[PDB]
Amino acid sequence: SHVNGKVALVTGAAQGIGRAFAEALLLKGAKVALVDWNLEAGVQCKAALDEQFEPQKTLFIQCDVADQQQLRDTFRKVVDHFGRLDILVNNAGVNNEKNWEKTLQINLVSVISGTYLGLDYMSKQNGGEGGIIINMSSLAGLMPVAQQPVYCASKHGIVGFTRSAALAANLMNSGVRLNAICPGFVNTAILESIEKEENMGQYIEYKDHIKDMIKYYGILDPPLIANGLITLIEDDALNGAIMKITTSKGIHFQDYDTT
Ligand SMILES: NC(=O)c1ccc[n+]([C@@H]2O[C@H](COP(=O)([O-])OP(=O)(O)OC[C@H]3O[C@@H](n4cnc5c(N)ncnc54)[C@H](O)[C@@H]3O)[C@@H](O)[C@H]2O)c1
Ligand SMILES: CCCC[S@@H](O)c1sc2nc(-c3nccs3)cc(-c3cnc(C)n3C)c2c1N
């Protein structure tokens, strides 16, 4: 009943972890707006979901989340079409240390923009019913990566932002909980980007160190990450939680020594 009948918006939903989230949420009874900048992947994804689940339970919107006008229009569309917003998953992201400025815009700036749009629609102080926002970070949000310093920067920023916005929500009595998920390696297109100079820039020569870490720890499949998302949504005690998901230690929250 925490998911059933709710409306979710998932960015980066065309493939990888985003699609896995959409499938898990549809199975739990949600309506899902799939939001992605890749029109062709998006159409393929919705067409496949339309075979499994009911067509009216999904909407596909093409949107570059880093474009604030497109993002604002996307939100408006979702709420017009489904009549409310209950669950926001800021999941879109890239790996690109060469055009690292753009990586920050997609990975960090867009998570903040999306979060604040979600709060605009969902906060009880703005006429909403409350809700949950889940931001995708990474284990790279908690630990350093020599070959991906700007990705690391962006994923650390998501952690700081989400912990902070969760405390602000309590203060503002918005009735919105904000949590983040920090997966280890997951079997998606993004893993392939480490092979590419276009993505790695000056770090390409050291790509094998990442490969050795992959070998060391192993790779999750997207559907296992989705279980984690469902836990966050179902447990309404969870606010400001940083959920780690790895093969080595499972599903565990980050502990912090706060004052
Ligand atoms: N796969 C991993 O090992 C791993 C580990 C930890 C965190 N993550 C994070 O998980 C999230 C999902 O990535 P994934 O591994 O499923 O990769 P993926 O590349 O398969 O999926 C990312 C999706 O986001 C979309 N997207 C990218 N930039 C966009 C933008 N500007 N606007 C709209 N959509 C955009 C892409 O088109 C794609 O469909 C990302 O935030 C990524 O950083 C991945
Ligand atoms: C294209 C790269 C996308 C994957 S990143 O988000 C990512 S996920 C990940 N997971 C882990 C895990 N540690 C324990 C269990 S799984 C480690 C890394 C990583 C890679 N290189 C280092 C030093 N680290 C910490 C990384 C890392 N760089």
Side-chain angles (χ1 to χ4, degrees), residues 119 122-126 128-130 165-177:
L119 293 170
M122 290 188 272
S123 168
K124 286 166 172 183
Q125 302 315 123
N126 294 319
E129 296 307 309
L167 299 168
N170 178 65
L171 279 181
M172 283 166 166
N173 304 113
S174 61
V176 179
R177 296 173 296 115

Side-chain angles (χ1 to χ4, degrees), residues 85-240:
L85 179 63
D86 300 291
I87 301 169
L88 174 60
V89 187
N90 294 305
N91 161 82
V94 296
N95 173 51
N96 187 329
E97 291 302 315
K98 185 166 169 184
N99 184 359
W100 55 264
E101 303 93 342
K102 190 169 69 144
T103 296
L104 292 163
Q105 286 295 312
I106 295 165
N107 286 8
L108 181 49
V109 175
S110 296
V111 166
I112 295 159
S113 299
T115 294
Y116 282 159
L117 288 164
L119 293 170
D120 287 343
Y121 286 93
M122 290 188 272
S123 168
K124 286 166 172 183
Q125 302 315 123
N126 294 319
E129 296 307 309
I132 173 160
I133 298 174
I134 298 104
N135 290 332
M136 290 291 314
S137 179
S138 178
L139 225 62
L142 294 175
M143 273 158 35
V145 188
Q147 290 79 33
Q148 291 175 284
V150 177
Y151 181 85
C152 186
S154 75
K155 289 312 191 174
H156 272 65
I158 292 168
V159 172
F161 176 69
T162 301
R163 294 184 64 198
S164 297
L167 299 168
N170 178 65
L171 279 181
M172 283 166 166
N173 304 113
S174 61
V176 179
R177 296 173 296 115
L178 303 94
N179 298 293
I181 302 179
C182 293
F185 303 112
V186 190
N187 183 17
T188 74
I190 217 144
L191 281 196
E192 298 157 2
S193 70
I194 68 163
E195 305 289 349
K196 276 185 286 212
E197 184 286 348
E198 308 87 80
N199 294 94
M200 298 297 289
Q202 64 178 301
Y203 304 103
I204 192 57
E205 284 288 278
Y206 310 96
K207 65 151 215 320
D208 291 353
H209 309 292
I210 305 203
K211 302 186 71 175
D212 295 342
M213 290 289 282
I214 292 172
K215 197 194 172 186
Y216 186 100
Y217 283 114
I219 307 167
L220 293 161
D221 298 295
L224 307 168
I225 311 299
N227 307 331
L229 175 79
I230 301 304
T231 292
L232 287 174
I233 294 161
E234 273 172 5
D235 182 346
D236 59 32
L238 290 184
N239 188 41

Side-chain angles (χ1 to χ4, degrees), residues 24-97:
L25 288 164
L26 286 166
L27 187 65
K28 298 292 274 219
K31 307 181 199 64
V32 179
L34 317 154
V35 175
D36 202 289
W37 67 348
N38 184 330
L39 169 73
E40 296 81 5
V43 167
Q44 184 170 299
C45 172
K46 179 157 159 74
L49 297 174
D50 282 348
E51 273 191 290
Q52 280 173 300
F53 304 99
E54 295 177 347
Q56 72 280 15
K57 297 302 215 184
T58 63
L59 180 74
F60 173 65
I61 305 169
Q62 186 189 23
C63 172
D64 171 357
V65 298
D67 187 313
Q68 295 180 113
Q69 193 51 49
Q70 289 181 50
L71 194 60
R72 178 147 20 60
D73 292 336
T74 299
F75 275 72
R76 192 175 291 117
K77 169 74 146 144
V78 165
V79 170
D80 280 350
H81 178 94
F82 283 123
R84 53 164 178 161
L85 179 63
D86 300 291
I87 301 169
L88 174 60
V89 187
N90 294 305
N91 161 82
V94 296
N95 173 51
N96 187 329
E97 291 302 315

